[PDB]
Design a protein around this ligand. Structure first.
Ligand SMILES: *[C@@H]1O[C@H](CO)[C@@H](O[C@@H]2O[C@H](CO)[C@@H](O[C@@H]3O[C@H](CO[C@H]4O[C@H](CO[C@H]5O[C@H](CO)[C@@H](O)[C@H](O)[C@@H]5O[C@H]5O[C@H](CO)[C@@H](O)[C@H](O)[C@@H]5O)[C@@H](O)[C@H](O[C@H]5O[C@H](CO)[C@@H](O)[C@H](O)[C@@H]5O)[C@@H]4O)[C@@H](O)[C@H](O[C@H]4O[C@H](CO)[C@@H](O)[C@H](O)[C@@H]4O[C@H]4O[C@H](CO)[C@@H](O)[C@H](O)[C@@H]4O[C@H]4O[C@H](CO)[C@@H](O)[C@H](O)[C@@H]4O)[C@@H]3O)[C@H](O)[C@H]2NC(C)=O)[C@H](O)[C@H]1NC(C)=O
Ligand SMILES: *[C@@H]1O[C@H](CO)[C@@H](O[C@@H]2O[C@H](CO)[C@@H](O[C@@H]3O[C@H](CO[C@H]4O[C@H](CO)[C@@H](O)[C@H](O[C@H]5O[C@H](CO)[C@@H](O)[C@H](O)[C@@H]5O)[C@@H]4O)[C@@H](O)[C@H](O[C@H]4O[C@H](CO)[C@@H](O)[C@H](O)[C@@H]4O)[C@@H]3O)[C@H](O)[C@H]2NC(C)=O)[C@H](O)[C@H]1NC(C)=O
Ligand code: JYY
Ligand SMILES: *[C@@H]1O[C@H](CO)[C@@H](O[C@@H]2O[C@H](CO)[C@@H](O[C@@H]3O[C@H](CO)[C@@H](O)[C@H](O)[C@@H]3O)[C@H](O)[C@H]2NC(C)=O)[C@H](O)[C@H]1NC(C)=O
Ligand SMILES: *[C@@H]1O[C@H](CO)[C@@H](O[C@@H]2O[C@H](CO)[C@@H](O[C@@H]3O[C@H](CO)[C@@H](O)[C@H](O)[C@@H]3O)[C@H](O)[C@H]2NC(C)=O)[C@H](O)[C@H]1NC(C)=O
Ligand SMILES: *[C@@H]1O[C@H](CO)[C@@H](O[C@@H]2O[C@H](CO)[C@@H](O)[C@H](O)[C@H]2NC(C)=O)[C@H](O)[C@H]1NC(C)=O
Ligand SMILES: *[C@@H]1O[C@H](CO)[C@@H](O[C@@H]2O[C@H](CO)[C@@H](O)[C@H](O)[C@H]2NC(C)=O)[C@H](O)[C@H]1NC(C)=O
Ligand SMILES: *[C@@H]1O[C@H](CO)[C@@H](O[C@@H]2O[C@H](CO)[C@@H](O)[C@H](O)[C@H]2NC(C)=O)[C@H](O)[C@H]1NC(C)=O
Ligand SMILES: *[C@@H]1O[C@H](CO)[C@@H](O[C@@H]2O[C@H](CO)[C@@H](O)[C@H](O)[C@H]2NC(C)=O)[C@H](O)[C@H]1NC(C)=O
Ligand code: NAG
Ligand code: NAG
Ligand code: NAG
Ligand code: NAG
Ligand code: NAG
Ligand code: NAG
Ligand code: NAG
Ligand code: NAG
Ligand code: NAG
Ligand code: NAG
Ligand code: NAG
Ligand code: NAG
Ligand code: NAG
Ligand code: NAG
Ligand code: NAG
Lengths: 128, 442, 133, 133, 133, 48, 48
């Protein structure tokens, strides 16, 4: 299983800095990365970055190098293999050209070559 | 695609289980009632392996270790009181007088000077001997004639005076093929999924201290002050609070007593109380009024999380029961104290000293009964000299009544052991594992 | 290197735990479990001693009737009936832990133990017939 | 198929019983044999537990010093001295049962156990010398 | 031939003692060690019984995690670090006895037991990868 | 057949004053007497 | 009918029915148990 509910689809105007939430269930939040993906209309879908809910290690594209803050808070043990988590997303020098739908997707495997691969996605959020 | 079963021996997977736990102890060598000399020597390197990424379920209210320790300690006492003296000749008529009158009215009958006829080494010749007895060990006949408290309900066996009642740290260990899982969560409730989990070959040093209301010489929390019950909304389930700071208590029996041996038969000797050297004073306990109020406030704060930031909770004394449960009963240097605690639980706290200490008047018993069965009682031989012990109050055993009010109690011996074994859990190892992979024999 | 310790890789992936099996294998019979005094602690320790060897040999008994004596990773000739678990290899050894794997394979653990049993009886019968010439 | 059960082929021919050895092998240590209370039934059961593992390992000990560890049908290098039994193969495996066979081979069972013992000691010495290059 | 008996070659050279290992192997579990009466002699004998199987299996456990199950002379892949003993082969097997050899190799006996342990874990992992095709 | 195997070329150290067999036999015999005198008559009425 | 030497008269014959012949036993006296304290913890159960 696994669910990733995202925040609301409210809108702002250029110059601001919005926070996007992603709440997880049905799986151990620490065991898989959390990816942030952007599907703009005036560009192809872009991978923004992933972060480790276990090790805190983050990795984002150089196009978002000094403009994005990725944070996650510690999980909550529900069962032996189930926990609830949350991931956060921020933008710095923000304009209106960053308009589109934003998704959060967790990693694929816990090890191997496709560890962090965005596998299970959220329902997305509309922006400005 | 082409997948066959592949067998793996030694896979890190376990299942909950019940097993026999043996005892481990450290090197100290007389012989305590807990027989710690017969336990396997504990490793000077108490190995603890941390189980990263593991999240185990715990349930201190179904834990089997507490039910096993409850029977072990009782068996240790049964094992130690078997070969000792049967005091059935003591169940005889006693001619008692108060010992040294004139002090404070009805506090002179608290200890009596009783004389009685006793069997000697010769079966056909009696002796008139006397002994000092506390009031809680005698009852009248209705004249100044008395008898021991237990003569109509129980046979009495005095403890072999070479045994020590001082608790010694006991380590519980699981056999090979089993494991002990500790919950490292510093704010752990007692039940539920504990995130931080580590495995240990043996548990930490657990002193088998049997006390009432106040938990002594126990372990302390590292953060806040936890409160543990299986159904806190139920008023009939004892609340087990566990401090993080130790509120010190000083108990003493200032009466300098002398032990007089009395030959009641061939090889049989009854240890009577000779007399009192110096002042006949009152045994009691001190506890810093400042630290007890501060620590009692922390319990209030954590009790608020289960009853609301606005509600009002109050502390009252025991609401009745047996003497062992209505008082802070414990063992101090041999003698069994029974301390009034109306001064510790007499406070109402609102929604939102510093020099002296509060004292606790304790009475002393010698004929103490077995808690489980009826018909079995022990005679604690008289301790010579002045007694004084210094220990830590590290927890409580409270009771809700259904704005809020909390009173102490707890005559169940396994509530003591729950306060120390809540972190631990017994699981069995199952090292055989089968899984698919593209590997085929031959 | 790493060396997590006894059960140290209980939360690691099945493939990562499958590289530290000696870590658990050696602690299945030792520990701290010299006269036999039958006190409350002596009877307790004696049972702890007999219980360890008993459970240790029951695992070695199954390991013997499967042709895996003295092995930590032996391969068999029993194919993987996908009704046991249709999960793929990459999502098993790089994803699951041995604890949650045993949780879902638990129903068929007695079925598989029978297929490994008679496969070894027939294989040893085949080897005898091949050495009859 | 058939599946006669534990000792189910005790009256069958040696060859037919030689196809259901796992049926007896798995019941040599299990059964029904958790605290150790030393009552009349508790002492009785504890002996029943130690007795099973003791006899089980004595058979595995001989199976080890013969080079047959974890085997149900192992072949050896000890030829059959016809003075043990001059019966032919067809009148042994398609005729006798294991019970009556053990009845007539009973005298030489200690003789054969010695030939299998030193044959394994010398074979392992040969294998070491062959791997010395 | 010779046949010195149980421990009969304790004072012989290591090579000469290395030809009579079955002589000691068979007496590691038997002897004289049927009801369990818990008298002073009965408790004494029961401990003597559990102690034998316990020590016997601890040696077989190490022999298993080294890949030497059911072997008297098994060869390994752990090279001889000369810091253990710089003595030459001829002055070891035609000179020393096993008693005085164990006396000087005693410090490194725990070091060697670890190298044989993980060498077997990695070898079985290699054999699985080779049979994955 | 009280089997005795002679250990040729062996030379062992002994110390009868630290031997554990004597400390074990000392307790065994005392236990045998304790075991045998448990179920017998207590003559406490004779102390007259 | 089972005996080791039936021709011997000193070996008990053990017969075993195939049909059960029922038997009804009773003590109709309604007795009362009276406890008597004969010592500390000791009570003798007399017939009231
Ligand atoms: C748990 O908590 C419990 C509760 O807190 C606690 O219990 C406490 O236990 C201890 C020990 O068990 C108790 O300590 C005792 O205290 C006695 C009383 O001491 C106080 O009072 C005296 C006398 O007061 C009069 O005199 C002064 C002037 O000197 C006036 O100012 C007073 O107002 C009063 O005089 C008027 O009032 C009278 C009536 O009220 C009138 O009759 C009178 O005419 C006047 O009008 C004071 O002197 C004391 O001061 C000393 O202590 C203070 C701190 O309080 C210090 O600054 C300083 O050290 C002072 O010296 C104090 O205020 C003590 O008498 C008693 O010690 C004696 O008894 C023991 C045993 O009996 C002896 O072994 C010991 O040697 C002492 O004997 C000496 O004194 C007697 C009496 O005079 C002599 O007869 C004797 O010969 C001997 O004299 C020698 O020593 C003298 C000094 O030591 C010296 O002066 C002589 O010259 C000679 O050398 C003991 O210490 C304490 O009371 C308990 N607490 C309470 C609340 O009761 C427990 O311990 C806690 N812990 C636990 C359980 O673990
Ligand atoms: C407990 O559970 C957690 C969560 O499942 C486990 O953490 C995961 O472990 C696996 C395996 O160890 C990880 O998979 C690997 O992922 C790396 C990608 O990370 C690399 O890239 C980072 C960003 O570019 C980089 O910063 C890292 O470099 C160092 O820096 C960090 C800083 O924190 C440090 O922590 C690192 O350790 C590095 O030192 C990092 O290199 C990827 O490179 C791996 O692929 C290689 O290895 C595999 C085989 O393992 C091989 O197949 C590949 O081809 C390649 O060679 C591998 O995929 C995963 O990222 C971890 N985190 C998750 C899943 O969130 C943890 O191990 C568990 N522990 C226990 C004890 O159970
Ligand atoms: C004290 O209780 C007993 C009295 N006598 C006999 C007895 C005589 S003879 C005989 C015998 O031979 N048995 C063989 C067949 O039965 N056994 C007992 N045996 C087992 C006993 C217990 O474990 C037991 O009840 N406990 C434990 C000690 C407690 C305590 C402290 N410290 C305490 C006491 C009061 C206040 C605070 C703390 C509390 C309760 C026990
Ligand atoms: C408890 O009561 C007993 C009485 O049953 C007390 O024993 C008696 O105590 C008195 C007073 O000490 C003794 O008398 C004294 O005898 C000595 C020696 O001859 C003499 O010098 C004194 O002047 C005084 O007369 C008496 O002998 C003694 N009797 C017995 C049988 O012991 C006991 O003292 C009381 N104990 C306490 C603590 O009050
Ligand atoms: C709680 O723990 C403390 C410390 O572990 C216990 O204090 C110990 O109490 C005993 C007896 O009260 C002390 O033994 C005594 O030592 C003195 C001095 O040698 C001696 O005169 C006495 O005869 C007796 O042997 C012991 O020293 C003391 N230890 C320390 C460190 O203070 C306390 O009793 C425990 N309380 C409970 C209720 O378990
Ligand atoms: C309790 O009383 C005993 C005597 O009944 C005291 O023991 C004496 O101690 C002193 C030490 O100064 C010795 O010189 C005496 O020889 C002892 N007498 C006996 C009979 O033993 C003991 O000191 C008293 N304890 C206290 C705390 O006062
Ligand atoms: C209980 O007794 C102990 C020791 O008798 C007290 O601790 C002492 O406190 C004083 C304070 O000035 C220190 O100087 C000592 O070093 C302390 N002794 C020890 C052994 O720590 C303690 O204060 C007493 N508490 C109560 C409530 O009476
Ligand atoms: C009472 O509690 C204090 C504090 O928990 C104990 O003192 C600690 O003792 C440990 C012993 O391992 C030391 O490592 C700590 O440094 C001590 N801390 C402090 C603040 O003193 C004390 O031992 C307890 N006493 C009793 C009798 O239980
Ligand atoms: C045997 O006698 C006892 C009394 O000695 C009878 O017990 C009474 O039973 C009736 C039932 O109808 C109750 O109402 C009484 O309260 C009982 N009395 C006592 C003292 O227990 C018992 O019924 C008699 N049994 C028979 C078979 O007659
Ligand atoms: C992201 O936000 C947190 C919020 O407190 C802040 O502490 C952290 O420094 C931020 N990250 C960066 C790279 O500024
Ligand atoms: C003991 O003293 C109390 C209080 O003065 C008194 O009521 C009681 O009668 C006395 N008992 C004896 C036996 O002297
Ligand atoms: C002891 O017995 C005598 C009878 O000889 C009796 O008079 C006396 O009161 C008895 N003493 C006690 C203390 O019971
Ligand atoms: C104990 O804490 C756990 C932690 O989640 C909680 O689920 C449970 O309800 C708590 N129980 C009580 C009685 O407080
Ligand atoms: C706790 O007690 C209340 C009433 O006292 C009851 O309604 C509730 O069901 C209990 N909870 C559990 C888990 O038993
Ligand atoms: C509790 O306090 C009240 C108030 O004086 C008192 O009457 C009662 O006896 C006390 N109970 C106990 C057990 O101390
Ligand atoms: C306890 O003390 C209070 C006052 O301190 C008193 O009212 C109460 O009766 C005492 N309890 C007992 C059982 O003596
Ligand atoms: C899988 O198992 C079932 C019964 O457990 C059997 O009927 C079926 O034929 C098996 N299929 C394969 C492919 O092994
Ligand atoms: C890993 O295992 C869990 C166990 O339930 C499963 O839900 C998840 O889908 C698995 N991951 C992949 C990528 O299949
Ligand atoms: C195992 O059997 C139980 C029986 O109710 C069933 O609920 C469960 O789904 C089964 N699991 C698997 C993996 O077959
Ligand atoms: C058969 O055994 C006897 C002694 O048991 C021996 O003398 C004889 O040489 C053996 N013959 C063969 C053919 O093995
Ligand atoms: C075994 O030895 C006994 C000894 O009397 C003998 O009667 C019997 O014939 C022998 N059997 C065989 C098969 O050698
Ligand atoms: C021998 O062992 C030491 C440590 O025990 C190690 O440092 C050294 O490299 C080893 N040398 C060889 C040749 O194995
Ligand atoms: C018991 O029955 C058997 C059956 O053949 C017979 O041989 C034997 O003689 C009988 N014994 C007695 C005592 O009847
Ligand atoms: C049975 O008893 C008769 C005489 O009572 C005796 O002659 C016969 O030998 C006995 N049979 C056996 C088998 O002992």
């Amino acid at each position: 299983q696994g669910q990733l509910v995202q925040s609301g689809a409210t809108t702002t105007k250029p110059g601001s800095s919005v926070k996007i939430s992603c709440k997880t269930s049905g799986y151990r939040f620490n065991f898989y990365h959390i990816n942030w993906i952007r599907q703009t209309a005036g560009r192809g879908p872009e991978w923004m970055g992933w972060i480790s809910p276990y090790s805190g290690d983050k990795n984002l594209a150089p196009a978002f190098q000094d403009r994005v803050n990725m944070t996650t808070d510690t999980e909550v043990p529900v069962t032996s293999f189930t926990s609830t988590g949350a991931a956060y997303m921020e933008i710095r020098n923000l304009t209106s050209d960053d308009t589109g739908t934003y998704f959060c997707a967790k990693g694929l495997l816990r090890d191997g070559s496709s560890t962090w691969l965005p596998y299970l996605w959220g329902q997305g959020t509309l922006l400005t | 695609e082409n997948l066959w079963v592949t067998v793996y021996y030694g896979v890190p997977v376990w299942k909950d289980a019940e097993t026999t736990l043996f005892c481990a102890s450290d090197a100290k060598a007389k012989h305590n009632v807990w027989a710690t000399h017969a336990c396997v020597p504990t490793d000077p390197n108490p190995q603890e392996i941390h189980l990263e990424n593991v999240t185990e379920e715990f349930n201190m209210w179904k834990n089997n270790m507490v039910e096993q320790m409850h029977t072990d300690i009782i068996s240790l006492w049964d094992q130690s009181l078997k070969p000792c003296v049967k005091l059935t000749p003591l169940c005889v008529t006693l001619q008692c007088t108060n010992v040294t009158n004139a002090i404070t009215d009805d506090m002179r009958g608290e200890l009596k000077n009783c004389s009685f006829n006793m069997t000697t080494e010769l079966r056909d010749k009696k002796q008139k001997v006397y002994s000092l007895f506390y009031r809680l060990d005698v009852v009248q006949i209705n004249n100044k004639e008395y008898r021991l408290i237990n003569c109509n309900t129980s046979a009495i066996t005095q403890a072999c005076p070479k045994v020590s009642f001082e608790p010694i740290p006991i380590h519980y260990c699981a056999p090979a093929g089993f494991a002990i899982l500790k919950c490292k969560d510093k704010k752990f409730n007692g039940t539920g999924p504990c995130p931080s989990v580590s495995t240990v070959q043996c548990t930490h040093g657990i002193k088998p201290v049997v006390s009432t209301q106040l938990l002594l010489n126990g372990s302390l929390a590292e953060e806040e002050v936890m409160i543990r019950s299986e159904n806190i909304t139920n008023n009939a389930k004892n609340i087990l609070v566990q401090f993080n700071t130790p509120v010190q208590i000083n108990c003493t029996r200032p009466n300098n007593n002398t032990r007089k041996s009395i030959r009641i038969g061939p090889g049989q000797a009854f240890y009577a109380t000779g007399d009192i050297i110096g002042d006949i004073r009152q045994a009691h306990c001190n506890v810093s009024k400042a630290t007890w109020n501060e620590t009692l406030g922390k319990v209030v704060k954590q009790l608020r999380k289960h009853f609301g930031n606005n509600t009002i909770i109050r502390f009252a004394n025991s609401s009745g029961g047996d003497l062992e449960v209505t008082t802070h009963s414990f063992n101090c240097g041999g003698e069994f104290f029974y301390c009034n605690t109306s001064g510790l639980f007499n406070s109402t706290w609102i929604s939102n000293g510093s020099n002296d200490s509060i004292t606790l008047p304790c009475r002393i018993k010698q004929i103490i009964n077995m808690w489980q069965r009826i018909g079995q009682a022990m005679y604690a031989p008289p301790i010579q000299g002045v007694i004084r012990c210094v220990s830590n109050i590290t927890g409580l055993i409270l009771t809700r009544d259904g704005t809020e009010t909390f009173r102490p109690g707890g005559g169940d011996m396994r509530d003591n052991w729950r306060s120390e074994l809540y972190k631990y859990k017994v699981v069995k190892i199952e090292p055989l594992g089968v899984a698919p992979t593209r590997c085929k024999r031959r | 290197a790493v060396f997590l310790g006894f059960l140290g890789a209980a939360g690691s992936t099945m493939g990562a735990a499958s590289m530290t099996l000696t870590v658990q294998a050696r602690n299945l019979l030792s520990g701290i479990v010299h006269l036999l005094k039958l006190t409350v602690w002596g009877i307790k320790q004696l049972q702890a001693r007999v219980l360890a060897v008993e459970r240790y040999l029951r695992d070695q008994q199954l390991l013997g009737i499967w042709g895996c004596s003295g092995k930590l990773i032996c391969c068999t000739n029993v194919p993987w009936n996908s009704s046991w678990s249709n999960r793929n290899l990459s999502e098993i050894w790089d994803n699951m832990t041995w604890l949650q794997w045993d949780k879902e394979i638990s129903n068929y653990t007695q079925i598989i133990y029978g297929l490994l049993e008679e496969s070894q009886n027939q294989q040893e019968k085949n080897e005898q017939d091949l050495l009859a010439l």
